Amino acid sequence: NVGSLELNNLSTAEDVATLQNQLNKLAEEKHKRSTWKGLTFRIAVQDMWEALTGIPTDIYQNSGRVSLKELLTRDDRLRGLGLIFFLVAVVSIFF
Amino acid sequence: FTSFVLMLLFTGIILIATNELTYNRPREIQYRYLPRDLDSFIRTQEMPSAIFSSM
Amino acid sequence: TSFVLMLLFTGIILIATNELTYNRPREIQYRYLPRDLDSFIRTQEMPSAIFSSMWDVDTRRGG
Amino acid sequence: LYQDPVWFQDLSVIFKRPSEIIPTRDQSDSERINAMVRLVLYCSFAVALIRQNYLYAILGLAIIAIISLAYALGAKKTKSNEAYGNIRPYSVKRSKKSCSKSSANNPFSNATVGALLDNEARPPACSYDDNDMASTMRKNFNKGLFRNLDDVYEVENSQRQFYTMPVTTAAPDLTAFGQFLYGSKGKTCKE
Amino acid sequence: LSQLVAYGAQDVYLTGNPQITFFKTVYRRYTNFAIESIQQTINGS
Structure with a gap:
């Protein structure tokens, strides 16, 4: 009985698409849950990929003029610093 | 001396791996089609009553 | 060794804090969109069934 | 319209570009926090270099986190720093x-x-x-x-x-307009 | 007028489409308004 309008879906979508709105937002929900589940405690082997993404991109973040700490570390990078666990295990094996 | 900071990082990085789960917080809302009769009624109606809504 | 024990103690405390703050729930609301034009027309009732009663029997006399 | 110079808070990497500021004066609250960050970083790193135990730097970073977290969370939203008219008595220090x-x-x-x-x-x-x-x-x-x-x-x-x-x-804001056309001139000749 | 539009449950679940008899008009409930007519000032001879 009333008109309620959703402005955007994290990317402004003009009121032209009809089913593209459902497909896009279903893909959005799928991506969000995929990232949540692959970003929680339960990880199998993805730590290697996260570390390999962390190091070069963490270094490159300072190759820009600035990079906010909320983005230098929280952009899927915090566990990307999980390789320090590997290196400390290695040296503790040594030392 | 060195072993102290090594163990410090050893526990701290596990703590970080525990911490990192909190970052992603997306909102979930689903979409569904109108009932056919209600859809026809809404499309037929001429006046909107309330002007606009943003959510 | 004692430093390791205290560090593990505080690490376990903060990990327990993370686990307890991890279980906060999330809520989903349903947003209803109007049917598209083509789907509407495909779903539309044929006039042969909407008002077929206009010649059913009559209104002044029964059946 | 009123304009102020540029500043920023300790996030990003500003804590190195205008380096070598340690303690606050006539600076914004974000700049004051940045200066405290510089103090703590240099002090803790120097202490770690003097006594090579590699943990004074860790404590310095931890207290950096404490100060930054306190500034980030404890900010009071009750600000009405709006400039108009003849008086701006709420604060005289640098602010946005x-x-x-x-x-x-x-x-x-x-x-x-x-x-x-x-x-x-x-x-x-x-x-x-x-x-x-x-x-x-x-x-x-x-x-x-x-x-x-x-x-x-x-x-x-x-x-x-x-x-x-x-x-x-x-x-x-007619008072500002009048002060624009007609300066106060402070203590004038007739006084 | 060009933004995507959707309804909440309150306009779907708690309602529906009533069947209307040709001969039973159901008039719409509407906003409160009034009409006045006044003269404007003309600038220019």
């Missing part, structure tokens, strides 16, 4: 002047009736170039509007007619 940012309902912050809605006292819509609000204004104007793709310097959908009115508050 309040701006009424452009909004979806009021793309140009013209204060048509938004002033009577909730604000009552509405801070002026500050300059067109202050805080990149030009991009936000253009985005808000181009919300739900289709262009013919024959104008990449868009004037076709009548940008020019729309603008920010000279005054964006409930009152024209």
Whole structure:
């Protein structure tokens, strides 16, 4: 009985698409849950990929003029610093 | 001396791996089609009553 | 060794804090969109069934 | 319209570009926090270098986190640092002047009736170039509007007619205008 | 007028489409308004 309008879906979508709105937002929900589940405690082997993404991109973040700490570390990078666990295990094996 | 900071990082990085789960917080809302009769009624109606809504 | 024990103690405390703050729930609301034009027309009732009663029997006399 | 110099808070990497500031003076609160960060970082790193135990730097970083977290969380929202008229008594230290940012309902912050809605006292819509609000204004104007793709310097959908009115508050602030035309001149000859 | 539009449950679940008899008009409930006519000032002879 009333008109309620959703402005955007994290990317402004003009009121032209009809089913593209459902497909896009279903893909959005799928991506969000995929990232949540692959970003929680339960990880199998993805730590290697996260570390390999962390190091070069963490270094490159300072190759820009600035990079906010909320983005230098929280952009899927915090566990990307999980390789320090590997290196400390290695040296503790040594030392 | 060195072993102290090594163990410090050893526990701290596990703590970080525990911490990192909190970052992603997306909102979930689903979409569904109108009932056919209600859809026809809404499309037929001429006046909107309330002007606009943003959510 | 004692430093390791205290560090593990505080690490376990903060990990327990993370686990307890991890279980906060999330809520989903349903947003209803109007049917598209083509789907509407495909779903539309044929006039042969909407008002077929206009010649059913009559209104002044029964059946 | 009132303008202030540029600053930033300890996030990003500003803590190195204007380096070698340790303790606060005539600086914004963000700048004061940055200066405290510089103090703690240099002090802790120097202490770690003098006594090579590699843990004084860790404690320095931890207390950096404590100070930054305290500043981030404990900020009091009860700020009304709005400059108009003859007096600005709330604070004399460096601070960011309040701006009424452009909004979806009021793309140009013209204060048509938004002033009577909730604000009552509405801070002026500050300059067109202050805080990149030009991009936000253009985005808000181009919300739900289709262009013919024959104008990449868009004037076709009548940008020019729309603008920010000279005054964006409930009152024209006549005192500031008068002080502009007629300076106080402090202690004059007749005094 | 060009923004995507959707309804919440309150306009779907708690309602529906009533069947209307040709001969039973149901009039719409509407906003409160009034009409006045006044003269404007003309500038120019």
